C-alpha cells in the first residue's frame, strides 16, 4: 500500500562540536579620531582567536 512518506522538512547531521571547522583571527580595536582606522589588540586577549 504505497502512500509515500512525510518529507516536508529537511533533516540534517552536524559535527560533535556543533560549529565544525574554524580559522585564526587577531583582535582589532578602532582609532577613534578616524572614520575607518584600526589598531591590533594584543593586550589581555590571545593572538590565536577561533
Amino acid at each position, epitope marked *: 500500500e504505497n502512500h509515500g512518506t512525510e518529507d516536508e522538512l529537511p533533516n540534517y547531521c552536524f559535527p560533535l562540536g556543533g560549529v565544525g571547522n574554524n580559522s585564526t583571527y587577531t583582535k582589532v580595536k578602532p*582609532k*577613534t*579620531g*578616524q*572614520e*575607518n582606522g584600526w589598531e591590533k589588540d594584543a593586550t589581555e586577549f590571545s593572538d590565536k582567536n577561533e
Partner: single-chain antibody
Amino acid sequence: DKDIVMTQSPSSLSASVGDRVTITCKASQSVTNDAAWYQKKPGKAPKLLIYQASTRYTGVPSRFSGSGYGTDFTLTISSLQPEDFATYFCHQDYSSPLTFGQGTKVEIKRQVQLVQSGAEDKKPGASVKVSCKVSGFSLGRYGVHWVRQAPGQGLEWMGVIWRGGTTDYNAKFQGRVTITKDDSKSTVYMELSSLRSEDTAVYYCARQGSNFPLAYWGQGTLVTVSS
C-alpha cells in the same frame, strides 16, 4: 579618559629669506605614528601639510617635512620663503576628542565645497545656530567636524557628527554644543547655548579624508558676544 594635549615649542620664531626652520611638538600621551601638521593664515581656515608623521598631502611643497614617533613630533622647513610666514598647528587624528596645539608664530626679522552662514553677534545668556551648506559630496559618506579659534588663541575642536548620524562632542565645554544635519538641503548645523564672552570666536566647518586628517574646510563664521 585622559586628555590628549599637544604642547608646541618654541611658541614664536623669527626668520629671514632662505632660512632653515624647526618646530617640535610634545604630546601628553602616545598617539603612535598618527599626528598631523597644519599651516594657517590668520582668518582663513588651516591647510594640511604632513600626515602619518612623514607623508605629504597633494600639492604640499618639497620644503615642508615631518619626523618623530610616540609623543614627540617635529615640523621642519628646509629653506623658508615669505609664503611660509603664517601660524602653524600640531594635531592628532589618532583618538577622538581630536586635538590641536597652542599654535606657533613664524614672523619676519626686523568639486568639494563648504559654505557657511553670514556673520553676526548676540548678548550673553542666549543661544545661536550656524550653518554649513555642503556640496560636491554626500553627508552619509563623510562625517562633518566643527572647530573654532578664539581671537589670537589656539584651535578648539567643538564636535563632529559621524557618517551614520552619530554625534561626538568635546565634553570639556559641558555639552553646550549640539550638531545636527539635513540630508535633503545637504547642510550641517551647529547650535550653541548658554553663550558667554569667552565664546566670541571664528567658527569653522571641516571634513576628513577616507580616514586621514582634516582637509576640506568652510569659510568660517564670526560669532561676537560682548558684555
